Amino acid sequence: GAMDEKFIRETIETRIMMEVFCLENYFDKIAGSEELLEIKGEIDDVAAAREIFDDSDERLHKLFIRASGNELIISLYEKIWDRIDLVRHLNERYVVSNREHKELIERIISGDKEGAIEKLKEHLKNVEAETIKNLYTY
Amino acid sequence: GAMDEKFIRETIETRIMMEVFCLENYFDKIAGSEELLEIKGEIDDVAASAAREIFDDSDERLHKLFIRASGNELIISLYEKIWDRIDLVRHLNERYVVSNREHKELIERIISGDKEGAIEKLKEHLKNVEAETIKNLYTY
Ligand SMILES: [Zn+2]
Numbered sequence: 001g002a003m004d005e006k007f008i009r010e011t012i013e014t015r016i017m018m019e020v021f022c023l024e025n026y027f028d029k030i031a032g033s034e035e036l037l038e039i040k041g042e043i044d045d046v047a048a049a050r051e052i053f054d055d056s057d058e059r060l061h062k063l064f065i066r067a068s069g070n071e072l073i074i075s076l077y078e079k080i081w082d083r084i085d086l087v088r089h090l091n092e093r094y095v096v097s098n099r100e101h102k103e104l105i106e107r108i109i110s111g112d113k114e115g116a117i118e119k120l121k122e123h124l125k126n127v128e129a130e131t132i133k134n135l136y137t138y
Numbered sequence: 139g140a141m142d143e144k145f146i147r148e149t150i151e152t153r154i155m156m157e158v159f160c161l162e163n164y165f166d167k168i169a170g171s172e173e174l175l176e177i178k179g180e181i182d183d184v185a186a187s188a189a190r191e192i193f194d195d196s197d198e199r200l201h202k203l204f205i206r207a208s209g210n211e212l213i214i215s216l217y218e219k220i221w222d223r224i225d226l227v228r229h230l231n232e233r234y235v236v237s238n239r240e241h242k243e244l245i246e247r248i249i250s251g252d253k254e255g256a257i258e259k260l261k262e263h264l265k266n267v268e269a270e271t272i273k274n275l276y277t278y
């Protein structure tokens with residue numbers, strides 16, 4: 001099939017399914033992880049947010065999945081990662097996605113589980129909307 | 139790795155992740171489907187005690203329906219990828235009568251519009267299946 005609106009929407013919906021489940025169910029492990037603080041540091045360390053982005057982005061989303069310790073979930077996420085990576089490269093949103101990550105991280109470390117789950121959904125839906133908005137602006 | 143408790147628990151957790159997401163987000167499509175009613179009919183057409191022939195066919199169809207209703211081909215394809223594993227785990231412990239009862243209750247919650255209760259029942263069903271499979275991992 002084509003690289004089209006449906007392909008994009010399916011990718012982001014799958015991410016919401018997986019990443020939000022893991023954030024919700026492994027919230028305390030994520031919040032307590034050294035990896036989270038390292039990612040936060042990498043974001044905080046710069047004003048922009050092109051260099052910051054690709055690393056920090058993959059690391060943050062993959063952390064939520066890894067924290068499950070469920071090797072089947074981890075493997076399924078790795079299986080679809082090239083597709084996830086394609087879709088993220090369709091539209092450059094470094095500054096704004098970075099801001100959303102930073103806010104997500106602060107909700108997590110401050111213990112606002114309900115708000116972190118909301119922010120992760122909002123973030124993925126925002127990314128989706130902007131990617132679809134720009135599908136014909138190449 | 140081994141076919142052990144962790145393997146089993148990971149399988150059921152994955153199913154809860156996928157199937158509950160799809161039931162929650164495509165509830166009205168599932169509730170309105172002809173397939174759901176065909177499955178219910180197949181369950182209702184034999185005694186609670188006769189679930190064995192019932193079971194394999196109705197069970198795969200019911201769980202796969204939830205996924206299919208998403209219309210998300212990536213989700214559908216990932217569920218298909220893990221299906222042989224799901225099918226292994228279900229075969230580890232024979233629970234035909236009781237799982238069939240749980241399917242019937244789940245279906246009734248769906249067709250009656252009780253979305254919150256259907257989601258609860260699906261989770262309870264998968265967790266009940268998990269617990270019994272682990273309970274019996276050394277009773278072979
Ligand atoms: Zn790149």
Ligand SMILES: [Zn+2]
Binds near residue numbers: 057097101
């Ligand atoms: Zn992101």
Ligand SMILES: [Zn+2]
Binds near residue numbers: 194229
């Ligand atoms: Zn069989």
Ligand SMILES: [Zn+2]
Binds near residue numbers: 237
């Ligand atoms: Zn079942």
